[PDB]
Design an enzyme around this catalytic site. Structure first.
Site, PDB file in Angstrom:
ATOM      1  N   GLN A 180     -14.109  42.532 -24.181  1.00  0.00           N
ATOM      2  CA  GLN A 180     -14.301  41.294 -23.565  1.00  0.00           C
ATOM      3  C   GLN A 180     -13.362  41.273 -22.271  1.00  0.00           C
ATOM      4  OE1 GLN A 180     -12.689  37.203 -24.958  1.00  0.00           O
ATOM      5  NE2 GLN A 180     -11.683  38.973 -24.013  1.00  0.00           N
ATOM      6  N   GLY A 181     -14.111  41.066 -21.168  1.00  0.00           N
ATOM      7  CA  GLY A 181     -13.232  41.074 -19.984  1.00  0.00           C
ATOM      8  C   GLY A 181     -13.426  39.907 -18.975  1.00  0.00           C
ATOM      9  N   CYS A 182     -13.851  38.572 -19.440  1.00  0.00           N
ATOM     10  CA  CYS A 182     -13.504  37.413 -18.476  1.00  0.00           C
ATOM     11  C   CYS A 182     -14.640  37.404 -17.493  1.00  0.00           C
ATOM     12  CB  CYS A 182     -12.068  37.575 -17.792  1.00  0.00           C
ATOM     13  SG  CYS A 182     -10.872  36.403 -18.225  1.00  0.00           S
ATOM     14  N   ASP A 206     -12.985  50.330  -7.272  1.00  0.00           N
ATOM     15  CA  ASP A 206     -12.215  50.112  -8.564  1.00  0.00           C
ATOM     16  C   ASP A 206     -11.860  51.221  -9.437  1.00  0.00           C
ATOM     17  OD1 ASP A 206     -10.718  48.209  -9.970  1.00  0.00           O
ATOM     18  OD2 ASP A 206     -12.366  47.412 -11.396  1.00  0.00           O
ATOM     19  N   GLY A 238     -17.426  37.937 -19.002  1.00  0.00           N
ATOM     20  CA  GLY A 238     -18.322  38.421 -20.062  1.00  0.00           C
ATOM     21  C   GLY A 238     -18.025  39.454 -20.663  1.00  0.00           C
ATOM     22  N   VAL A 293     -18.792  42.623 -23.810  1.00  0.00           N
ATOM     23  CA  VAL A 293     -19.296  43.947 -24.167  1.00  0.00           C
ATOM     24  C   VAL A 293     -19.500  44.255 -25.459  1.00  0.00           C
ATOM     25  CG1 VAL A 293     -18.698  46.539 -24.026  1.00  0.00           C
ATOM     26  CG2 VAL A 293     -18.528  45.042 -22.070  1.00  0.00           C
TER      27      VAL A 293
HETATM   28  N1  LIG Z   1     -20.547  52.600 -22.196  1.00  0.00           N
HETATM   29  C1  LIG Z   1     -19.691  52.296 -22.975  1.00  0.00           C
HETATM   30  N2  LIG Z   1     -19.371  52.915 -24.414  1.00  0.00           N
HETATM   31  C2  LIG Z   1     -18.460  52.617 -24.837  1.00  0.00           C
HETATM   32  N3  LIG Z   1     -17.571  51.752 -24.765  1.00  0.00           N
HETATM   33  C3  LIG Z   1     -17.684  50.756 -23.777  1.00  0.00           C
HETATM   34  C4  LIG Z   1     -18.778  51.137 -22.751  1.00  0.00           C
HETATM   35  N4  LIG Z   1     -18.476  50.252 -21.774  1.00  0.00           N
HETATM   36  C5  LIG Z   1     -17.513  49.395 -22.004  1.00  0.00           C
HETATM   37  N5  LIG Z   1     -16.831  49.800 -23.501  1.00  0.00           N
HETATM   38  C6  LIG Z   1     -15.957  49.272 -23.803  1.00  0.00           C
HETATM   39  O1  LIG Z   1     -16.066  47.858 -23.701  1.00  0.00           O
HETATM   40  C7  LIG Z   1     -14.547  47.218 -23.797  1.00  0.00           C
HETATM   41  C8  LIG Z   1     -14.282  46.007 -23.114  1.00  0.00           C
HETATM   42  O2  LIG Z   1     -14.835  45.868 -21.720  1.00  0.00           O
HETATM   43  P1  LIG Z   1     -14.020  46.461 -20.643  1.00  0.00           P
HETATM   44  O3  LIG Z   1     -12.472  46.320 -21.222  1.00  0.00           O
HETATM   45  O4  LIG Z   1     -14.377  47.708 -20.184  1.00  0.00           O
HETATM   46  C9  LIG Z   1     -14.059  45.441 -19.343  1.00  0.00           C
HETATM   47  F1  LIG Z   1     -13.989  44.454 -19.668  1.00  0.00           F
HETATM   48  P2  LIG Z   1     -15.251  45.447 -18.233  1.00  0.00           P
HETATM   49  O5  LIG Z   1     -14.642  46.296 -17.105  1.00  0.00           O
HETATM   50  O6  LIG Z   1     -16.257  46.359 -18.978  1.00  0.00           O
HETATM   51  O7  LIG Z   1     -15.727  44.230 -17.930  1.00  0.00           O
HETATM   52  P3  LIG Z   1     -15.952  43.733 -16.313  1.00  0.00           P
HETATM   53  O8  LIG Z   1     -14.680  43.828 -15.761  1.00  0.00           O
HETATM   54  O9  LIG Z   1     -16.459  42.191 -16.413  1.00  0.00           O
HETATM   55  O10 LIG Z   1     -17.162  44.577 -15.848  1.00  0.00           O
HETATM   56  C10 LIG Z   1     -13.699  48.482 -23.182  1.00  0.00           C
HETATM   57  O11 LIG Z   1     -12.522  48.591 -23.971  1.00  0.00           O
HETATM   58  C11 LIG Z   1     -14.460  49.299 -23.117  1.00  0.00           C
HETATM   59  O12 LIG Z   1     -13.846  50.735 -23.831  1.00  0.00           O
END
Ligand SMILES: Nc1ncnc2c1ncn2[C@@H]1O[C@H](COP(=O)(O)[C@H](F)P(=O)(O)OP(=O)(O)O)[C@@H](O)[C@H]1O
Ligand SMILES: [Mg+2]
Length: 267
Positions: free
Chosen positions: A17-19, A128, A21, A23
């Site tokens: 989860q990344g602030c 990014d 929203g 995942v």
């Molecule tokens: N297609 C995929 N297949 C498998 N796993 C995936 C995946 N996509 C993401 N994960 C997984 O979701 C986690 C939390 O989101 P993250 O730490 O990446 C960040 F938040 P994210 O950059 O996604 O949020 P945001 O910054 O709001 O865009 C990550 O550790 C990433 O491995």
């Protein structure tokens, strides 16, 4: 149009989860395993959350995480391809990082360069590019991900340690500033996921980068590879190499550049 019914999904496992929203892992039409980039209740405006999905709509490449579908109203979702091995950063830091040597790491770099060469051809900028935004699948397959800040050439902030000085200072984001980020990514690969500029805080970083400071050749890294990093870090964005060049260079690395490579303890 890319739109699907919420019916078709079902969010199972919460992966990170990344602030901005959340995942989840999940399924789609029951049949297909997917990843669902959600949003907990009204974080950041729904349509600036929309436009990562539009960037992903126009882009399609084997080395980019493929968009599957979108749900353009509340709660919003962004359904994408699922990568079993998670982020590259965690992969390098984790249990598998011990066994990765330069041939594996250079090949991962070649794939990332291939995906960015496609971005280069399509006249986009990622803005990014970093190991935390690369996703690993089976067979050490690496794909560029997270196009939240990606935009066509003609919100939030930006990690200075990965950002080209001209972009961090004057907002000049080009494909060449992405090339800078790729060079930083190369240090992440060769140091098994260590944060760039060790012991240096954020604008000690830029003030040194502006005095012409560059990260030194990592231990056991061939200088030819560090040369490539330094080319990516040239002060003039336009002196920086193309991703087309970087892809060919890395793909051919152990025949044309380091034909006498021999394995070490770490690289
Ligand atoms: N297609 C995929 N297949 C498998 N796993 C995936 C995946 N996509 C993401 N994960 C997984 O979701 C986690 C939390 O989101 P993250 O730490 O990446 C960040 F938040 P994210 O950059 O996604 O949020 P945001 O910054 O709001 O865009 C990550 O550790 C990433 O491995
Ligand atoms: Mg991410």
């Amino acid at each position: 149009a890319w739109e699907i019914p919420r019916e078709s999904l079902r969010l199972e496992v919460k992966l990170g989860q990344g602030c901005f929203g959340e995942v989840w892992m999940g399924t789609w039409n029951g049949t297909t395993r997917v990843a669902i980039k959600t949003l907990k209740p009204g974080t950041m405006s729904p349509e600036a959350f929309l436009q990562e999905a539009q960037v992903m709509k126009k882009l399609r490449h084997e080395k980019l995480v493929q968009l599957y579908a979108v749900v353009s109203e509340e709660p919003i979702y962004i359904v994408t391809e699922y990568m079993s091995k998670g982020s590259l950063l965690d992969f390098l830091k984790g249990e598998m990082g011990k066994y990765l040597r330069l041939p594996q790491l250079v090949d991962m770099a070649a794939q990332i360069a291939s995906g960015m060469a496609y971005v280069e051809r399509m006249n986009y900028v990622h803005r990014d590019l970093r190991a935390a935004n690369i996703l690993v699948g089976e067979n050490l397959v690496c794909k560029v991900a997270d196009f939240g800040l990606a935009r066509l050439i003609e919100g939030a902030k930006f990690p200075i340690k990965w950002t080209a000085p001209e972009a961090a200072l004057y907002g000049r984001f080009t494909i060449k500033s992405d090339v800078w980020s790729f060079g930083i990514l190369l240090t992440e690969l060769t140091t098994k996921g260590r944060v760039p500029y060790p012991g240096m805080v954020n604008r000690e970083v830029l003030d040194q980068v502006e005095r012409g400071y560059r990260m030194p050749c990592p231990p056991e890294c061939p200088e030819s590879l560090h040369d490539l990093m330094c080319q990516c870090w040239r002060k003039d964005p336009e002196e920086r190499p193309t991703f087309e060049y970087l892809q060919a260079f890395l793909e051919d690395y152990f025949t044309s550049t380091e034909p006498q490579y021999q394995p070490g303890e770490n690289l």
